[PDB]
Model the fold of this input.
Amino acid sequence: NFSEQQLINWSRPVSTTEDLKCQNAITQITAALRAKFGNRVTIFLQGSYRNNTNVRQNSDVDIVMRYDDAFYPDLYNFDELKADTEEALRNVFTTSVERKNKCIQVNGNSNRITADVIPCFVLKRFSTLQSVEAEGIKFYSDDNKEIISFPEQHYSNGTEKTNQTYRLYKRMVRILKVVNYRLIDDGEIADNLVSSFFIECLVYNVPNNQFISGNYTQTLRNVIVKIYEDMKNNADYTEVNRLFWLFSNRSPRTRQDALGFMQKCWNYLGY
Ligand SMILES: Nc1nc2c(ncn2[C@@H]2O[C@H](COP(=O)(O)OP(=O)(O)OP(=O)(O)O)[C@@H](O)[C@H]2O)c(=O)[nH]1
Ligand SMILES: Nc1nc2c(ncn2[C@@H]2O[C@H](COP(=O)(O)OP(=O)(O)OP(=O)(O)O)[C@@H](O)[C@H]2O)c(=O)[nH]1
Ligand SMILES: Nc1ncnc2c1ncn2[C@@H]1O[C@H](COP(=O)(O)CP(=O)(O)OP(=O)(O)O)[C@@H](O)[C@H]1O
Ligand SMILES: [Mg+2]
Done:
């Protein structure tokens, strides 16, 4: 239903860290957090701006604030950390600050994008897949869930795969994110059937030899068919971080979710 050129267009990043409104958000929010926490935190990005997978204009940026003085000192429970983070932001951004289940949101304006600020601590956890202790981040949601993430390993492994696949790994992720948003807008799937993270992990497990240089239409066909068949075949997919399984008992998302999503994409694209 869509031409090769249309797929190419959909595969391009829309919002990036080069955007003035993104730079403005990061600069302003960083200053507000440093005013309270100084060097006791590491500030970095995760999510679509970090991995370069944005497909929507003026997308929100995920700014991680890792309180890590104990692990990275200068050469306290989470409830207090999140409250102190909300206070630091409210002192500067006042009515634009909204506490959320998993972050503090700083709503944007004409000159800056909206940001999700994610206070967190250092996390260390053993990976049986790689038989090593892995370092990531941990935080707690307002509904009492322990949220664990490995953004550095996610970033590095995804970058490596796109570098090995003629840059098509992330281009295919972006295409599927576009299709996801369209299916949601059309009311064809629930807005939480999949997530950007889930899509990124699914495509990551498609072997590199399925990505065909200069052929977006056939590469995308290969990607959808491979994930679809793998889901029917009970495949053991890894997260992009390669430290844990995608379909582990910690995750409520299922192979059936991925199978249904692939089917909806296939039908929408008209293969
Ligand atoms: N391990 C793990 N990490 C997650 C999960 N959800 C989000 N993350 C992390 O948080 C980052 C930002 O989350 P999202 O905003 O939902 O994903 P995104 O890549 O920014 O895509 P967008 O929907 O365009 O914002 C992702 O890149 C992941 O690194 C999850 O379910 N499991
Ligand atoms: N450090 C470094 N940066 C580069 C290099 N080549 C290009 N860049 C730049 O790094 C930024 C990231 O570029 P890309 O990784 O190609 O991202 P993109 O072009 O927006 O999207 P895709 O190519 O589809 O992944 C851009 O500003 C490029 O100009 C390089 O060899 N080394
Ligand atoms: N496993 C995870 N690991 C790291 N960051 C996560 C994460 N899940 C969510 N986040 C981050 O927290 C931010 C908020 O996540 P969302 O998916 O919007 C739920 P929420 O918005 O916090 O609940 P709410 O809208 O009901 O208040 C995301 O932008 C993301 O950057
Ligand atoms: Mg995001």
Observations:
- Residues 47-48, 60, 62 surround magnesium ion (ligand 4) (CB under 6 Å).
- The longest helix spans residues 20-37.
